[PDB]
Amino acid sequence: QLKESGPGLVAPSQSLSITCTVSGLSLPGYGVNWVRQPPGKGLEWLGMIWDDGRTDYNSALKSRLSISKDNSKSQVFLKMNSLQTDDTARYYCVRNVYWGQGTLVTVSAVVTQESALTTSPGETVTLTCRSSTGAVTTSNYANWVQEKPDHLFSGLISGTNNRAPGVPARFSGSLIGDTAALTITGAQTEDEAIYFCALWYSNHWVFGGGSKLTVL
Ligand SMILES: CCCNC(=O)NS(=O)(=O)c1ccc(Cl)cc1
């Protein structure tokens, strides 16, 4: 499990410090990611620290960000200076398919998904995830993350097609044409939610705009 600890409220042009505290027995994946969601906007990848200690950053934010770790305290850190108003958002740390509940901070390549879809219980539905740079392959390690009311995030599929533990068998990840695809076979009412895909581009993640699946 993962748990963010943030100052709640930060002043414009001052700096932001969030601590991600990592607890449990197993550590799936290869490091710890920082992601944020501005209120009412989509998910945005911020950066990652690998288990060897190396870091990658959202290039658009690289100049203001620094990520570190304290292996003795089992924690990973996010620092961002020069806080702007558009920096208001929930901040999540994520390891593989596990997301923390996030902390809300208030300041004092393109991936395209179907924007909306409707289905009926027992019918099968497919969601798609297109890259603007070309075809999607397993080298992109397609992730599918389910946001269920309202800011709780859970990884459904990682590595294009690896079902996360405890995820119902009706969810399967695949490639279809040049897109990544998430198939919900025999959808149920409990699958009404928002589904985000993310694609790996050699040194950074990029999230899609998310799909609102309504189940009648
Ligand atoms: C090896 C090239 C990329 N692979 C990778 O990042 N694997 S990971 O640690 O398990 C991971 C899973 C989901 C997210 Cl969103 C972020 C990281």
JSON list of N, CA and C in Angstrom, two decimals, residues 67 96 117 144 206:
[
{"chain": "A", "resi": 67, "resn": "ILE", "atom": "N", "xyz": [12.55, 14.57, -7.56]},
{"chain": "A", "resi": 67, "resn": "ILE", "atom": "CA", "xyz": [12.05, 13.36, -6.93]},
{"chain": "A", "resi": 67, "resn": "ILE", "atom": "C", "xyz": [13.22, 12.63, -6.30]},
{"chain": "A", "resi": 96, "resn": "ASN", "atom": "N", "xyz": [3.22, 0.38, -10.14]},
{"chain": "A", "resi": 96, "resn": "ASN", "atom": "CA", "xyz": [2.64, -0.64, -10.99]},
{"chain": "A", "resi": 96, "resn": "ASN", "atom": "C", "xyz": [1.14, -0.37, -11.09]},
{"chain": "A", "resi": 117, "resn": "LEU", "atom": "N", "xyz": [-18.98, 6.17, -23.56]},
{"chain": "A", "resi": 117, "resn": "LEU", "atom": "CA", "xyz": [-19.53, 4.89, -24.02]},
{"chain": "A", "resi": 117, "resn": "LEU", "atom": "C", "xyz": [-20.65, 4.42, -23.10]},
{"chain": "A", "resi": 144, "resn": "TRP", "atom": "N", "xyz": [-4.19, 0.04, -18.06]},
{"chain": "A", "resi": 144, "resn": "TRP", "atom": "CA", "xyz": [-5.57, 0.48, -17.93]},
{"chain": "A", "resi": 144, "resn": "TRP", "atom": "C", "xyz": [-5.86, 0.62, -16.44]},
{"chain": "A", "resi": 206, "resn": "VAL", "atom": "N", "xyz": [2.29, 8.61, -20.70]},
{"chain": "A", "resi": 206, "resn": "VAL", "atom": "CA", "xyz": [1.31, 9.60, -21.16]},
{"chain": "A", "resi": 206, "resn": "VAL", "atom": "C", "xyz": [-0.06, 8.98, -20.98]}
]
